[PDB]
Design a protein that fits this description.
The structure is cut from a larger assembly and holds eight protein chains of eight kinds.
Chain A (H helix, E strand, L loop, with lengths): L24 H14 L9 H10 L13 H11 L6
Helix pairs in contact in A: 1-2
Chain C lengths: L9 H11 L9 H6 L53 H4 L7 H12 L34 H14 L5 H32 L8 H28 L1
Helix pairs in contact in C: 4-5, 5-6
Chain H lengths: L1 H7 L1 H4 L21 E2 L2 H5 L17 E6 L8 E3 L3 H12 L47 E6 L3 E2 L4 E5 L5 H6 L8 E11 L5 E8 L1
Parallel strand pairs in H: 6-8
Antiparallel strand pairs in H: 1-2, 2-3, 4-5, 4-7, 5-6, 7-8
Classes of the chains: A mainly alpha (87), B alpha/beta (266), C mainly alpha (233), D mainly alpha (244), E mainly alpha (91), F mainly alpha (104), G alpha+beta (93), H alpha+beta (203).
The structure holds magnesium ion (MG) (2 copies).
Protein name (chain D): Small ribosomal subunit protein mS42
InterPro entries (chain D): Mn/Fe_SOD_C (IPR019832), Mn/Fe_SOD_N_sf (IPR036324), SOD_C_sf (IPR036314)
Organism (chain D): Saccharomyces cerevisiae (strain ATCC 204508 / S288c) (Baker's yeast)
Chain lengths: 87, 266, 233, 244, 91, 104, 93, 203
């Protein structure tokens, strides 16, 4: 395959590192409730427990619960990982 | 021995401590029993029982792994004379050459120890510390494992200003008299810098040549050999090969120290 | 990197200082360094033999040295293009070390994939101390493996019991197989004996493997449930 | 590589054997040849493995729990057990049994005499092991001693590899129950290797293999041989391997 | 019941490992994933749209050498053949 | 005579600390087989004997680790030398009235 | 409690790099070659700096160049240049 | 000479290959030579390679491709699972025989194809295995059903008298959790080097 060697750079770093955390439980419950209410009319008792669960989740605050070291490694290992020729 | 051991009652079984002691006793007397194991490599044995420069062979160097140079793509062509050939995508260091350079290095190490010089063993890599400290202990010498702060010799008064200096006999007895504040503040320069990773501490080498100090280094197949007074071609990456070379050097310096002590006694 | 003058000319620089009177007292190292001089001759030295093979590097086959007809029946009467080019870089670039044994090794592990699964300690014991007569395979310090086979093949080749290499290799392989079978039988029977005389093994290899799998599966299951929930919502 | 250790007054041993119990030839058969053979076998087994560096006893302890690689365990066990036996035998390197040892024996065997204990040991040797084996007088974490037979290369140290009775033949109910209890204990260990704690130490190993007796005593008279060994053994060595 | 994406089906003749049952294995598998490559000039296939249409996007565009993964010369020949094809009626 | 540095770690960054760690490390090595079964000097307190301004948090944590493990050696098996080395690193009630009521 | 400058330099050299002070004081004789005033445009403003360049040398083939710099007056810069020169002494053939 | 010693020595003994360490395709046999250390040598990071190996690795076994690369790192993976598969197979004790009527290859220019088995089994088929309980006719092995069954480091084809609904349909695609016993009938080996086992589910 076609390898692509970079030139000598000042500093290998990702501009923004994404953590990719899991989505919020409360938000999910709210979405589920919304989906249920799309069907079954306005407020039928099929989504009786779901609403209660949502309320329990969003009692103390609107959301329930409230970084990736990737730059430090790149920064650390750039000089090694280079194919930079000798001095 | 074991003054605080509370022994269990005769009717009762052994205590935990008593049992441990019994196990230790068994180990000392009758565990290493059934056989003896000749011709096998214990890592520790290279630090505490290194061979003399004379008795080293090419075979021993090869076993240590000294022959394995850096890589074919990480080649400083300055080091061309030292390398034997390439194999497994790796330059292989000519080991007769390595031997001769090691002997030369060992002799200079011995000489400065005999003259009562300050030998300094510099080794920034991870596993090297313990063996480095042992070598430093062996000759009445010094070492550095935690990083070399740039300017220990060039800028000695700022860096090495507030550490205790000593006085010494023709033997190595402290002769503890008070050093004057003028007497203390002078730099105490090494008479041999010996590095285990010259490629990682260029700076130390540069200060040595500025500060006018002869230096020894394990020159791998990517390292500049002109940057030191006495290069030893060899495998600086593997921990055991370095230890072997270092241990040899320590032994050479130890001998020279012993000789100096003998001549003082005379 | 330029060739540094100042790392090896240390004693000269200090000798000058001593002469001047910049240095009152001589260093400890000074006499020692005088006695044992540095190299200071940082040359590129040429090499004329490949050490592994014993091929000649420097020489050129001439037109007069090749009298007979070539493949496709043409007589060489002139130097070719490559015979005129100045091959100096070959004298200086270090030789690629080649061994006949490497090919045999490669062949063996192609033929016997599961020999790779037998773990190999690469940490050498004293290489000088050993003394193996390859009349037979089973050496003492060395274990039984493809290497031992290959050494046996090489010995056979040397002695000319089997003039052909392939035949010698086959023979070595056949010697190995019997030994392997014997080893296999030894362990099984030892296990049987142990079972008979009331020995007790707490964790068998297969049981261990199952246990190892179980933890991973448990980890997967909780994660998988969470992922399904995520997907649903 | 595992090689046999140099015994004290080796040349004398070669010339004679052992004054009372073993001949020049009989001692050679048990040690100078058989031990060597065992060592060679162990080396062959454990040439390129991590086991090459370790001593026989430490190898055995490592290996004990593993069902496969039982051959290594057997060899290692044999090597250690045989050298213990030789150590017990040796004339020097007259000594009596220790007072402490005698007191311990008395405590263990309902206040019986040392001669009685010996007699019980020889009876056990006669009855328990068929074919090959070992006869140990051991000491455990409870300070009292006891007699331990093993059926070929069973170690006194680690109880799951005591190899103490033969299930090739028929067995008792009590023996079966004991086995079941052991198995349960092993299962309770809860480690990845699955190896229990055990602090059994051998005080008097005796070699019930045919490599010791068969030359001198013939196929019968193994009991007689055992008795002779018990009568004439190095007591200083025994005393040394007794106290905590 | 569960979807196909979150369970690695180990093949029949294959070996496996404790790791191989994991989520991490599946992720690794997901991460790590012809006649013109075989060694025959693509300019034989200019009267064979069926085969040339494999090296073309749904709309009709020719695919890049990064995508198709060809030798540069072989790629250019393929491209030429395609262009010839569309100059003709066929393709 | 010769004027020479005391510590073998002299040339290293924080030589005194390194020297201090080395003795503890040696002790640990010596009594590494001894079976294992609080009031340690502060960072600032350690600095005055150790590195001073050159003392780092990581170094202090390492030192603590070294001391704690040594201390953990079962008290019955411990030595005099170990204890000597560790020695360095150590260091009104309200009631009712006459009439039985609590003022506050 | 409290030529003199040259002696102080020599003493400082002896501390830093083990050089003979008496030799530095007597046999070495210095000579300024260039004596610039030099400046940097900083946000504060133009910041001037006295640059010296001062050959020192024992008149027996031992010679050294040295440069030095001070924001404070030129005497300090010259001292620094002298120091540098004595650090860089060199045997010419 | 040095060259001869190098050719002999333990790094030359490891036959070189640049096969992927990560191969997500079908694995029928070991790709790479497994390389172990001793515990002592691991403690001072020495594996008998060009360089030291990172202190993060605490496993004694590994696999590698390059002693040193342009990236200034040895290309390795700390795993030796293939030995354990072999050991499991040995424990199971089902002898591999060629189902096609052919002579056993171990008895009697170059052929790169796999000579019989790849060396996972040098066992011969004719033996029985006695125990305290008796002579074992049926080999009992615990395994996991996937949907095929994973049985001691090998996937195996499975057969049964009746398909049990209670165990299967209760957890349709979580059958991997519950370990079931198996009776391994025989092990055949195809040209590609895959071990085609055949088991039978016991209840
Ligand atoms: Mg290097
Ligand atoms: Mg300048």
């Amino acid at each position: 395959p076609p390898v692509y060697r970079l030139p000598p750079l000042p500093r290998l770093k990702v501009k923004k590192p994404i953590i990719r955390q899991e989505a919020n439980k409360c938000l999910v419950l709210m979405s589920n409730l919304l989906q249920c209410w799309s069907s079954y009319g306005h407020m039928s008792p099929k989504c009786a427990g779901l609403v209660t669960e949502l309320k329990s989740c969003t009692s103390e605050s609107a959301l329930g619960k409230r970084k990736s070291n990737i730059n430090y490694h790149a920064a650390r290992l750039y000089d090694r990982i280079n194919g930079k020729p000798h001095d | 021995p074991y003054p605080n051991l509370i022994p269990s009652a005769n009717d009762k079984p052994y205590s935990s401590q008593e049992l441990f002691l019994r196990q230790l006793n068994h180990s000392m007397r009758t565990a290493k029993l059934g056989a003896t194991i000749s011709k096998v490599y214990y890592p520790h044995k290279d630090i505490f029982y290194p061979p003399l420069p004379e008795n080293i062979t090419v075979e021993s160097l090869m076993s240590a792994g000294v022959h394995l140079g850096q890589s074919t793509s990480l080649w400083r062509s300055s080091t061309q004379s030292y390398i034997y050939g390439e194999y497994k995508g790796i330059h292989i260091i000519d080991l007769n050459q390595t031997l001769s350079y090691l002997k030369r290095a060992a002799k200079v190490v011995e000489g400065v120890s005999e003259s009562g010089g300050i030998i300094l063993f510099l080794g920034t890599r991870q596993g090297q510390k313990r063996g480095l400290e042992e070598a430093a202990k062996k000759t009445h010498g010094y070492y550095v494992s935690t990083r070399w702060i740039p300017g220990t010799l060039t800028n000695s008064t700022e860096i090495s200003g507030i550490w205790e200096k000593q006085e010494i006999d023709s033997n190595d007895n402290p002769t503890e008299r008070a050093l004057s504040p003028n007497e203390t503040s002078k730099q105490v320069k090494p008479d041999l810098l010996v590095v285990l990773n010259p490629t990682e501490n260029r700076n130390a080498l540069l200060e040595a040549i500025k500060s006018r100090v002869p230096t020894i280094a394990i020159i791998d197949t990517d390292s500049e050999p002109s940057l030191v007074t006495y290069p030893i071609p060899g495998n600086d990456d593997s921990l055991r090969s370095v230890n072997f070379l270092l241990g040899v050097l320590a032994r050479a310096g130890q001998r020279g120290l012993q000789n100096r002590l003998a001549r003082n006694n005379e | 990197m330029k060739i540094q003058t100042n790392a090896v000319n240390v004693l000269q620089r200090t000798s000058a200082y001593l002469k001047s009177g910049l240095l009152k007292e001589t260093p400890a190292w000074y006499n020692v360094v005088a006695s044992i001089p540095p190299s200071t001759k940082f040359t590129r030295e040429p090499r004329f033999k490949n050490p592994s093979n014993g091929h000649i590097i420097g020489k050129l086959v001439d037109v007069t040295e090749q009298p007979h007809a070539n493949n496709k029946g043409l007589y060489k009467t002139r130097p070719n293009s490559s015979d005129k080019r100045v091959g100096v870089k070959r004298l200086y670039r270090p030789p690629k070390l080649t061994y006949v044994e490497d090919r045999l090794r490669s062949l063996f592990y192609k033929q016997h994939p599961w020999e790779l699964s037998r773990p190999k300690i690469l940490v050498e014991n004293e290489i000088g101390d050993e003394n193996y007569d390859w009349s037979h395979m089973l050496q003492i310090g060395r274990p039984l493996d493809g290497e031992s086979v290959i050494q046996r093949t090489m010995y056979l080749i040397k002695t000319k019991q089997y003039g052909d290499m392939v035949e010698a290799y086959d023979h070595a392989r056949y010697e190995f197989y019997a030994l392997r079978m014997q080893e296999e039988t030894e362990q099984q029977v030892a296990l049987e004996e142990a079972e008979m005389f009331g020995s007790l093994f707490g964790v068998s290899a297969i049981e261990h493997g199952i246990q190892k799998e179980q933890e991973v599966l448990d980890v997967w299951e909780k994660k998988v449930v969470e992922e399904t929930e995520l997907m649903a919502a | 590589i595992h090689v046999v250790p140099k015994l004290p007054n080796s040349k004398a041993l070669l010339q004679n054997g052992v004054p009372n119990i073993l001949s020049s030839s009989g001692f050679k058969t048990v040690w100078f040849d058989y031990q060597r053979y065992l060592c060679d076998k162990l080396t062959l087994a454990t040439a390129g493995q991590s086991l090459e560096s370790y001593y026989p006893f430490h190898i055995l302890l490592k290996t004990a729990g593993n069902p496969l690689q039982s051959n290594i365990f057997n060899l290692a066990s044999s090597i250690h057990n045989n050298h213990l036996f030789v150590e017990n035998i040796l004339p020097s390197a007259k000594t009596e049994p220790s007072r402490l040892f005698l007191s311990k024996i008395k405590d263990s065997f309902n206040g019986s005499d040392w001669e009685v204990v010996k007699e019980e040991m020889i009876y056990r040797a006669e009855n328990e092991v068929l074919g090959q084996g070992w006869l140990f007088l051991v000491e455990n974490n409870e300070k009292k001693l006891f007699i331990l037979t093993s059926n070929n290369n069973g170690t006194p140290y680690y109880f799951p590899r005591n190899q103490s009775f033969d299930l090739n033949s028929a067995i008792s109910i009590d023996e079966f129950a004991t086995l079941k209890q052991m198995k349960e204990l092993i299962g309770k260990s809860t480690k990845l290797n699955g190896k229990v704690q055990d602090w059994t130490m051998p005080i008097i190993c005796v070699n019930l293999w045919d490599h010791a007796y068969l030359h001198d005593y013939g196929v019968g008279n193994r009991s007689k041989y055992v008795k002779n060994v018990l009568d004439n053994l190095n007591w200083s060595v025994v005393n040394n391997r007794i106290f905590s | 019941k569960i979807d196909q994406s979150l369970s690695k089906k180990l093949p029949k003749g294959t070996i496996y490992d404790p790791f191989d049952f994991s989520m991490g294995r599946i992720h690794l598998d997901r991460k790590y994933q012809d006649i013109m490559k075989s060694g025959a000039n693509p300019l034989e296939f200019y009267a064979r749209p069926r085969i040339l249409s494999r090296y073309v996007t749904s709309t009709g565009r020719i695919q890049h050498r990064d995508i198709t993964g060809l030798s540069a010369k072989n790629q250019r020949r393929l491209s030429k053949a395609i262009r010839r094809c569309q100059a003709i009626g066929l393709m | 005579r010769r004027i020479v540095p005391k510590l073998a770690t002299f040339y290293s960054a924080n030589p005194n600390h390194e020297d201090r760690i080395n003795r503890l490390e040696r002790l640990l090595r010596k009594y590494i087989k001894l079976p294992s079964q609080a009031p340690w000097i502060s960072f600032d307190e350690y600095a005055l004997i150790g590195g001073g301004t050159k003392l780092k948090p990581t170094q202090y944590t390492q030192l603590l680790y070294m001391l704690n493990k040594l201390h953990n050696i079962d008290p019955q098996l411990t030595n005099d030398e170990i204890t000597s080395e560790l020695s360095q690193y150590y260091k009104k009630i309200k009631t009712l009235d006459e009439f039985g009521r609590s003022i506050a | 409690l409290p030529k003199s400058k040259s002696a102080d330099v020599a003493a400082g050299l002896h501390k830093q790099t083990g050089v003979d002070p008496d030799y530095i004081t007597r046999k070495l004789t210095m000579k300024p070659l260039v004596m610039k005033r030099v400046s940097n445009q900083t946000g504060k403003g133009k910041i001037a700096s006295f640059y010296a360049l001062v050959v020192v040398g024992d008149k027996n083939g031992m010679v050294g160049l040295g440069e030095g710099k001070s924001r404070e007056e030129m005497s300090k810069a010259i001292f620094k240049a002298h120091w540098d020169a004595v650090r860089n002494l060199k045997e010419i053939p | 000479t040095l060259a001869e010693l190098l050719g002999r020595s333990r790094i030359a003994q490891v036959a070189n290959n640049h096969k992927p360490l990560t191969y997500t395709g079908k694995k029928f046999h070991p790709t790479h030579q497994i390389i172990e250390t001793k515990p002592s040598t691991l403690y001072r990071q020495e594996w008998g390679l060009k360089s030291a190996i990172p202190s993060k690795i605490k496993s004694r076994y590994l696999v590698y491709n390059d002693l040193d690369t342009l990236e200034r790192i040895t290309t390795f993976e700390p795993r030796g699972g293939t030995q354990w598969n072999r050991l499991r197979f040995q424990e199971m004790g089902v002898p591999i025989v060629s189902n096609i009527g052919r002579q056993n290859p171990f008895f009697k220019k170059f052929n790169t194809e796999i000579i019989g088995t790849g060396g996972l089994s040098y066992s011969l088929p004719g033996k029985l295995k006695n125990s305290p309980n008796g002579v074992i006719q049926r080999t009992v092995v615990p395994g996991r059903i996937l949907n095929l069954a994973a049985i001691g480091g090998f996937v195996a084809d499975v057969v049964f008298f009746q398909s049990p609904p209670s165990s299967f349909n209760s957890m349709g695609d979580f059958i991997r959790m519950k370990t079931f016993l198996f009776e391994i009938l025989e092990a055949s080996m195809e040209k590609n080097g895959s071990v085609s086992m055949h088991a039978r589910l016991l209840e």
